[PDB]
Amino acid sequence: NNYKKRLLGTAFKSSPFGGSSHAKGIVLEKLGIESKQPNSAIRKCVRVQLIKNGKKVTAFVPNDGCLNFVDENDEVLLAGFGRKGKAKGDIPGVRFKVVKVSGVSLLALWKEKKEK
Amino acid sequence: SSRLDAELKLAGEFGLKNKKEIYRISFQLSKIRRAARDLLTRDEKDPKRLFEGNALIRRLVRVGVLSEDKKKLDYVLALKVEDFLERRLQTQVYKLGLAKSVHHARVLITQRHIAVGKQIVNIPSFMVRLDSEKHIDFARPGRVARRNAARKAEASG
Amino acid sequence: SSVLADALNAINNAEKTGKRQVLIRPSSKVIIKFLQVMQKHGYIGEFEYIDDHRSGKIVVQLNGRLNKCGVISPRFNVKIGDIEKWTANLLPARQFGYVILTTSAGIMDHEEARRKHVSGKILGFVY
RNA sequence: GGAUAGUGGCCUACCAUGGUUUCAACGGGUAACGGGGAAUAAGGGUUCGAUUCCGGAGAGGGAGCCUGAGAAACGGCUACCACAUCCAAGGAAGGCAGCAGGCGCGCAAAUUACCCAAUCCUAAUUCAGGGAGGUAGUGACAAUAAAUAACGAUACAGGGCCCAUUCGGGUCUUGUAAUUGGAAUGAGUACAAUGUAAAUACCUUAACGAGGAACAAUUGGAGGGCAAGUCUGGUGCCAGCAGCCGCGGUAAUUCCAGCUCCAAUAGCGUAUAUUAAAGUUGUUGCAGUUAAAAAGCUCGUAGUUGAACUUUGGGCCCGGUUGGCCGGUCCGAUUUUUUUUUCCAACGGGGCCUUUCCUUCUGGCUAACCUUGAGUCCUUGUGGCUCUUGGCGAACCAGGACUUUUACUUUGAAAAAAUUAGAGUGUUCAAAGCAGGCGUAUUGCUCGAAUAUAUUAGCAUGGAAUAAUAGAAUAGGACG
RNA sequence: GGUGAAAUUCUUGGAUUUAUUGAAGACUAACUACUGCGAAAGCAUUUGCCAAGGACGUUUUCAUUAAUCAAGAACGAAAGUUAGGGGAUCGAAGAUGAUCAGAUACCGUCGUAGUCUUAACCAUAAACUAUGCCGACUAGGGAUCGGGUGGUGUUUUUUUAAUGACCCACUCGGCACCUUACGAGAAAUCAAAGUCUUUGGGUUCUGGGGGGAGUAUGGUCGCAAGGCUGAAACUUAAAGGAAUUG
């Protein structure tokens, strides 16, 4: 007998933690990032504090016309786009990624749906 | 691709019988376990091979199974998929005259009409066995099947 | 330092060159005994004729296919769910096979102790 | 010695230094209740566990108690710590981790309903009680099914089919901006359910009504991996796409939007774990000269491994199960070409012979043999056994005298149900269920509810190959 | 002098060039290779004293004693530390001389330390053969170390033989290496880097995309320099071998 080895490890304790299908949290600032090499654009993202851990994270309002939220107050749900321990990403260091809110998002919808 | 041309195959079965989904998937999985557990003959004549023998061989079936042989039923894995498909009213109830052509069939299978010798059988994918009794029943009455009995010579397979 | 694959890995190590077999370990009731089950089912020729310190008993002519390599193996289980499984070692179900097991009773062959429902150690496997 | 219901350092005393540990003690960690079993397994494995069932442990933290047969108790007290309520200011109360219900918390989970009918439980000879339990409400929450159309039709055909100088006999595919009838056909609503006298308005019937575009589809994708006629208008490295590869710098096969089309469909995304793919954690089953990977060099403890030798090889006796046809059967009772000669397999098992004790003395039985006191059957008497005179060893019980210690491997017993494997049966099929099935219908008959896996350790067994162990060396051998 | 060419310097001080002699510490030329010996690092002057070592030769003596090893340890180049001895040469730092756009260098030349040494530390290296140790088996030839025979070849031993010494030829042993099939590999190449479908003879060790890094922290070792142990966050999709062509 013998021998245990490396790779994926037990110890955890990250930043959304709940491996959450999101993370509710209020919309601290509206920081439209800026594209990485090769591609190039003003990558409209959003910074917010996670009600849960309070911990602050910033992620792409990724939609296509929807800094509709952009409510410094209002509270999205964020939620990572599995890279996993990485970002996509034309979009430079953004970890998780915008979700739904003010709690309720297509993200565009009720009534109609607009687009994006 | 093979994935593709497969996604052709399935649609072929898609009215090589009559379905509209992945009941092809149903029958498929079936064929697995049937085989599978079966193929796990393995083995000898373990008195087990015995019960299991005339057992799974008692798949027969009527409208169902093979004809007269085996033993090796993996043939089914060939058939079954391409055979177990028939049997049931889903198939073997168009091939019996009454039904004008698959479609013009399931609809009555549903729509109250079409009944297996007493009691309807809406379950538009039952199974047939000792069929000669698969009339209309009807109980003014089941019209589409009661007069269009061109099945009066439906000597088919 | 291990009389088994020692010599079966000289028969093995030989017929791949092709020839008329050669010397081996020293004898061993076990060496000679496999170098029997072999002949007794075929494959090898005639276990041979030396006698020295422990070098005694035999050489052993080759003959036939016997392809390829006698199996040496270095564990030891058996019976029912077993034997049948380690019959995956085999070069294919449909006959061919032969798994020179060690059987509580008798240094026997995949079947030769499949015999009277026997089992135990897994000494080796031929062709 | 004290306590205990009772072992014991359980607690006392007195006395002695002990007990564990690298074969991993001790200590640290657990977003740790254990085991049923769950998920993806070619196999081998990863991964999961508090829904049910067992066993445990706790009702805010923490002690201590009365009660008793039984509790360190939750729906009982007592004090402390902690929250926290009504006060005539004096004092008095409490424990939803039981139903409901609220707050809070967060990614995340429903009603202040009805009931004893069932299953059962608790109290004494009843029929009391029971948010145990069962009905409903909420709820595509994971699962079984499965309609959103079915006909041929009339003619327009654009024509394809055997070509004939035949400008088309029309068997025929289909777009049909055109048109038939099918008093079809489910979802709403008088009746009534063998039904829980509440489910009663519930699946089940039934009768009353009911598709000219509504009685109706979706989610995503259309650069490649991926597979989709994919085109037409807007955008210009702006907006945005894009899991990765990459798209976009006016003519965009990836953005935007229409058309179309692809994929799956009452269901599709997206997140996030995991399992597979992954022989990228490898016992099966990896790699290591340069690609990630030999320690500078030898020593050497633990660990892991370690040459071959000792019983063979010959001979005899009873065996049924697969077999060449029914069969206790080897010169034949069948599968053969005939105007006789005609092949027996192989498989495994028990016993006993050979320089070959199985543990056993006292001696305790059988049914087997040495074999004959009386006899025999018939196919050529060793094809059969009634028979009791002398007289087999280990079966074999039980006191009484002795045994060198294990691995392994073989059936075996015993302990759980559901879980899964899997027989049985038309739950309408299915998922399931453990029902059911005959009739001959005034107290009738009838089968079930299997088997399987029981894996480590224990027990019990049969085996003596492979591997340890010990024995007679100054003989303190070895018998009777 | 001194290089590309100069210069800096030395120099009517007797340098640079010779002439006797002695002085000092390094260092062991040439022969030296096709390599000998060592655990490894590493080991070339003379003689001697000290104790070791493989291979050979026999079957001498034992009989299981063994094989590889986390722990733990002995040796470990060079620099570098401690203290003393000296101190030839060269030569970190440091100066200056040229050279450059720029020179803190590369080219001069002085010169500290150090280079040597003894008692003590340090335990790293492209510490190499970048290839673990033990045993097998798988295929040919040549060449340089101990043992066997024929000895022949020329001389010892000499008045001669023989022997002797080298020396030639056939063997074997074990050495260091070379040259070409099956078989292995991504290649290159490999006498193993070989054998096994894809176990298989026993074991020690290390690897799991790059980076972030051999860094953070902890404990230990040390005088110091450092050694030994040794993360995670985050961050990227390529970095990397071999080959083939420009």
Add this chain to the structure above:
RNA sequence: GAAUUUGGACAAACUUGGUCAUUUAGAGGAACUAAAAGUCGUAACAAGGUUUCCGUAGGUGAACCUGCGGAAGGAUCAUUA
């Protein structure tokens, strides 16, 4: 019993200090990473224009240079073949 109370054994909890394990604040300091490039100088590659790398030790605006002693993972300018 109630009062009441002597000693006990349990033993909450109070205080004060210790010890673990798990988090966490901070002037500032010093890395890194996105980094493709802006600016100085050319270190590596072509004997990269002083062959290159290995320690180790100094010295540096940055890359570096130099000193001992290694390795070719080489210079093939070739005393040997």
